[PDB]
Amino acid sequence: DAENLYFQGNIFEMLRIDEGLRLKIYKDTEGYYTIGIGHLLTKSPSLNAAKSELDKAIGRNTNGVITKDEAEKLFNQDVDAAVRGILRNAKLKPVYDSLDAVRRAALINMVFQMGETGVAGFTNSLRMLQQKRWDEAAVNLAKSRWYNQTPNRAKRVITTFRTGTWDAYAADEVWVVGMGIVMSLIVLAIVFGNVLVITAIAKFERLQTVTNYFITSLACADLVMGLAVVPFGAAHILTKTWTFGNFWCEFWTSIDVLCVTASIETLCVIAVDRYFAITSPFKYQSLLTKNKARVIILMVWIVSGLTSFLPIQMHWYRATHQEAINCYAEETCCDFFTNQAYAIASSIVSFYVPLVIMVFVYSRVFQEAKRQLQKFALKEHKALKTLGIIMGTFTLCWLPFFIVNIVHVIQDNLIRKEVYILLNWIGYVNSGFNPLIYCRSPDFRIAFQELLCL
């Protein structure tokens, strides 16, 4: 067959898109307790009853959480059981034998979800599939209770019967392709822009100022983001696994919290710096010797190091629940789990304290402007646009992540994992935007003009 190409059309890839890999017991659309990939633990309303059924199926005390290895085996046990039920049942097998392999998955998909006896209930609909009345059965199936409870999944199945193609499922794969090239472009902009900013200030003596020294610390944190944090995050998400061992992912996690904390705090430092330099240019200039601007950045990185490496390498961030323990003991799993104390403590230091200081700073900059020795002119509006981009971009990139992060602490299961990852990557791209915001100055544009060889 020689088909090792991506999205082979088959039942296994069909159901995984529909059900999804969840390693903890969860309640499905109907309300029943489900684990793994659509594995129905029990029809009982007691989580305790579902656990013992799970423990009987697995053979150990799962505590409600199974490994990815075990979840795969239940799925295959569930798929083959659905295949056996079709071959055993007298209504399904005549329909099943007369179906091409693509529409066989759609029938097995139904039997997977609703069972042998439940799917055999479609007296007219199954009879239409024998007679190859696809569109006519498609309209028939859309009227079922199965359609009302899960309209989205039924559409994919009903369309799959109707066309005999994987059009309902093949489109999902473009997402992984488009996500990869988007994740790719993000790495380029962060590495290119930040190296370009670092190189300009270091090579050109005109740019070696105090405010730019703060820019340099910002550019270094954003650089390591694009070099270290972001590339492995793309590799982690696309391949669905971690391939570098436990130690390196805590060390990767350690760099992630390190750079983001240092980057955001430096934005806060730059904000206050410009407040002082704009509202008291002369007193401020007396203050900052080269040693202070050096010790300030030192504090930012010491504070950032204490938030990132010290809790993570000392296992203080470690969560205590069973699903965290397994991912901690699994070499290939590096999902992010933390106790409530670290999540709150890190969020305040990394984001909330800088946010409050930043918001207050630019407010007073805009507040100081009106009480000066002086009629709705342009540059006052033009200046207000500039800070709106600065604070607006910072806010819109990171405020969803750390709100959702804190919301995840207060109430569990409210944040699905995809939203949590998406917003972090929307936070990741602030590193690419920071050179575009803070390096608009005339001396930068000249330095970039010569660094790019005109």
């Epitope: 704009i278 008291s280 000066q372 608009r440 100055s441």
Partner: nanobody, 120 residues
Framework: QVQLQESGGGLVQAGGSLRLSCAAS????????MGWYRQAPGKQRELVAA???????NYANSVKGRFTISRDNAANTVYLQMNSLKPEDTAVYYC??????????????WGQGTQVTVSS
């Protein structure tokens, strides 16, 4: 789109007094610095006297106690009062405007230029 109009360039004897006046046109952000820079022959441009929009000033050490900077109350006009002029004070005084409209970087405006001559 902004203008700087420099006035008061003078020939004067040593110890005499000069007054330099700068006026600005267009639209300038409220948070700004207007100052005076001089460049001596074969020397680098240096700060002489500066005033912030809020009234805070700054003077070079060589001109402290001798030069006084003042500002118009509402017309973006700056006056440099130079007294006890020394022959070392012989340079060309440039009207400056430091502009904070773009928050991250200060953006300068420069004046035309006026000659000050002190005769020993």
């Amino acid at each position: 789109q902004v203008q700087l109009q420099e006035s008061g360039g003078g020939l004067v004897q040593a110890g005499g007094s000069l007054r330099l006046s700068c006026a600005a046109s267009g639209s300038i952000f409220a948070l700004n610095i207007m100052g005076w820079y001089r460049q001596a022959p074969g020397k680098q441009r240096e700060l002489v006297a500066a005033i912030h929009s809020g009234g805070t000033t700054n003077y070079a050490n060589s001109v402290k106690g001798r030069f006084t900077i003042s500002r118009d109350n509402a017309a973006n006009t700056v006056y440099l009062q130079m007294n006890s002029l020394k022959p070392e004070d012989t340079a060309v005084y440039y009207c400056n405007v430091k502009d904070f409209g773009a928050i991250i970087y200060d953006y300068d405006y420069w004046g035309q230029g006026t000659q000050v001559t002190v005769s020993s």
